[PDB]
Structure 1
Amino acid sequence: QCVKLNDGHFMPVLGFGTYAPPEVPRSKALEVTKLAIEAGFRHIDSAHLYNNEEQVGLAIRSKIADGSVKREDIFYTSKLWSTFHRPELVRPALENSLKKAQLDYVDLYLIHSPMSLKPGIFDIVDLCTTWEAMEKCKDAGLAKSIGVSNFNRRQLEMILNKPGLKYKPVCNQVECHPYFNRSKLLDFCKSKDIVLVAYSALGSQRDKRWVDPNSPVLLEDPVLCALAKKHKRTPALIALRYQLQRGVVVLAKSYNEQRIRQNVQVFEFQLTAEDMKAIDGLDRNLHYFNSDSFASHPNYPYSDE
């Protein structure tokens, strides 16, 4: 189960999310990534931010070297950090991510966020010049596909309307779940053959640096719980399955053996139209990442409602 991107490459519709907070040792990323691939995840999501590209690359290479998968059955993503928006900085950051991971190429490179930062407080950078630079990475074969993350609709339109555009973004990876379902943005992405990829699809890690602990816990929601009991699955599985039936590619982070295996069960059952409607009724503009440290950035994405 893959979707065709708008540049003719294929992305598997379920991905493994690799971020863990700095309190978790680096070494854990190697082990869970292996477990992920072993349970059947073929889409692995990382970034320069995560400080785990070496372990995620090792895990991938190890599962190739033990014969379980070829390179080409793995879809590996990484992301350009926000200090590296000036265009001359883009290929070197990708080359850097490739060497940490000890791979020849990434299946996908994303701009991690539109909120540019001084290299190395906010920066002002024409993100069309960043994008041109992402295109040259694809033309060089350093990334199979290129995309954006944390763009709102108007920020997407800016790239799509660029003079001399060579490659549209293949996807926009944004926060997306039953409390913040992004359906207007999803409709716009669909009208342009851009894949929406959902992060914090299970309600996020609730890290105190960015998430108010008073916020409702997505996986305690009573409608997801009732649906879980109706289907004899789990609330995580319902949140995951909702995204696939809306045409959304979904990430799922877990560092626990049993949850990793449970999550691939999303392929084994269906929700009804009435189920999908009950879930669409939970939407309440709740973006779990909600911090003073970005909220007044000039290109804050949630300034467009």
Structure 2
Amino acid sequence: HCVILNDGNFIPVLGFGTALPLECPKSKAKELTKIAIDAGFHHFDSASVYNTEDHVGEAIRSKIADGTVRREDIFYTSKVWCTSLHPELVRASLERSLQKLQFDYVDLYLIHYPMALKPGEENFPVDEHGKLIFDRVDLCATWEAMEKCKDAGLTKSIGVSNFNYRQLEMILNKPGLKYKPVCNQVECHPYLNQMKLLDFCKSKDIVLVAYGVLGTQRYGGWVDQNSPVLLDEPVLGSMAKKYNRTPALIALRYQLQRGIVVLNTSLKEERIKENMQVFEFQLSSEDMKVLDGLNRNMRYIPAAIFKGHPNWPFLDEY
């Protein structure tokens, strides 16, 4: 179950996310990755900032060793963090991730946010007032660095995450562009269906990869704990009954039928296995319209600590 990226590479349409809530020990990522592989997942999403890469890598290499899967069958994504967006620091970060993973290459590498922060070991550098220290970096220069990573063979494909319409256009119209971003990984679910951004990406052969498909893991420090819980939406409960599935399966299927590559995370083995059942049924055209009606501009992860940054992506309509 894959789709073809604009650079010719194949990406599985359903991927398991390896970000873990703060309350979880990082080693948890290793057990979950194993469980996911056994359940049939071949696409895994990670990032330098998650700090789960080494554990995810051990799980994968472990499943490759015992002959469960081959590296070529696994699609692994990483992301360069805000502190290494400087053109001279991008490749170093990728090489560091590859060292942690003990991998020869990653299948996809993305710019995590179009917002650079002060370079340094600390992922969240703050001043004496506790405010993040922003940095100015030419995003087009950063993209050129990403392209060089692809030409180095360190990553098979390159893309971006949390970019808005104008920022994507900035890259697409860049003089001397060599490789278009293969995707734009953003938050997307019934409460924030991204209709406009999705149509734009499609028109440019850019795949929209969605996180927050099930309402996000509601991370402390990022998601308002008082925001509504997506899966508690009555409409999803009613539709789950109609199709004799679950609210989660309904939300997952909704995105797949819109041409979106879906990410998902669960700390529970039973749910990891359940989510694979999304390929078992079809939502009717009319029910897809019903789900479209839930749109209410509810953004669970507005990256509020970045407010004020010149490149904060969520101010524009899309």
TM-score, normalised to structure 1, is 0.99
Question: Is the CA contact (8 Å cut-off) linking 1:212 and 1:290 kept in structure 2?
Answer: no
Tell me the amino acid that sits aligned with residue 206 of structure 1. Answer: R
Task: Using the TM superposition, give the Cα deviation of residue 294 of structure 1 relative to its aligned residue in structure 2, in angstroms.
Answer: 1.5
CA offsets, 1:264-293, max 9 Å, x none?
001111100111001000001111013541
For the pair 1:133 / 2:136, whether they are aligned, the reply is no
Aligned to 2:233: 221
Which residue identity lines up with residue 193 of structure 2 in the other structure? N
Report how many aligned residue pairs link the two structures: 305
Contact 2:302/2:314, CA 8 A, preserved across alignment: no
Q: Which residue of 210, 235, 251 maps to 1:239?
A: 251
1:173-184 → structure 2 map (5 Å cutoff)? 173-184=185-196
Measured at CA, do residues 291 and 170 of structure 1 come closer, stay the same or move farther in structure 2, by a change above 3 Å? closer
Cα deviations by residue, 1:51-90 (Å, 9 ceiling, x for unpaired): 1111100111111111111111100000001001110101
> Identity of counterpart residues, as a percentage?
73
Q: For 1:163 and 1:292, locate their aligned partners in 2 and report how far apart those are by CA, in whole Å.
A: 32
Q: Would you say 1:155 and 2:167 are equivalent positions?
A: yes
Label 1:291 to 1:127 Cα distance change in 2 as closer, same or farther (>3 A): closer
> For the Cα contact (< 8 Å) 1:82–1:113, is it kept in 2?
yes
Match of 2:18 in 1: 18
Contact 1:241 1:270 in 2 (8 A): yes
Matching of residues 62-77 of structure 1 within 5 Å: 62-77=62-77
Name the structure 1 match of 2:264. 252
Task: Return the TM-score normalized by structure 2.
Answer: 0.95
Q: Distance in 2 between matches of 1:149 and 1:180?
A: 16
1:142 to 145, 154, 171: 154
User: Unaligned stretches of 5+ in structure 2?
Assistant: 121-132
Distance 2:111 2:119 in 1: 15
2:287 alignment partner in structure 1? 275
Q: What whole-Å deviation, never above 9, does each CA across 1:83-121 have from its counterpart, x for those lacking one? A: 011101011100000000010000000001111111131
Could you say which structure has the higher helix fraction?
Answer: 1
- Residue 54 of structure 1 corresponds to 54
Distance 2:198 2:315 in 1: 17
* Per-residue Cα deviation, 1:192-242 (whole angstroms, up to 9, x for no partner): 000000001100111231111221110000111101000111111111000
Query: One-letter code of the match for 2:219?
Result: D
* Corresponding residue for residue 123 of structure 2: none
1: distance between equivalents of 2:161 and 2:51? 18
Report the secondary structure of 2:216's partner residue. coil
**Residue 296 of structure 1, CA deviation:** 2.2
User: Is the Cα–Cα contact under 8 Å of residues 227 and 238 in structure 1 kept in the other structure?
Assistant: yes
Following superposition of structure 1 onto structure 2, how do residues 34-53 of structure 1 map, counting pairs within 5 Å? 34-53=34-53
Is residue 80–residue 94 contact of structure 1 (8 Å, CA) maintained in 2? yes
SS in 2 for 1:79: strand
Corresponding position of 1:118 = 118
Code of the residue aligned with 2:29 in structure 1: it is A
Match for 1:206 among 218, 221, 241? 218
Contact 2:22–2:219 at 8 Å: present in 1 too?
no
Question: What amino acid does structure 2 have at the position aligned with 1:68?
Answer: T
What secondary structure does 1:20 align onto? coil
2:202 is the counterpart of 1:194: no
CA contact (8 A) 2:114 2:312 kept: yes
Measured on the aligned residues, the alpha-carbon RMSD in Å equals: 0.8
The separation in 2 between residues aligned to 1:87 and 1:112, in whole angstroms, is 14
Of the three residues 291, 299, 305, the one matched with 2:311 is 299
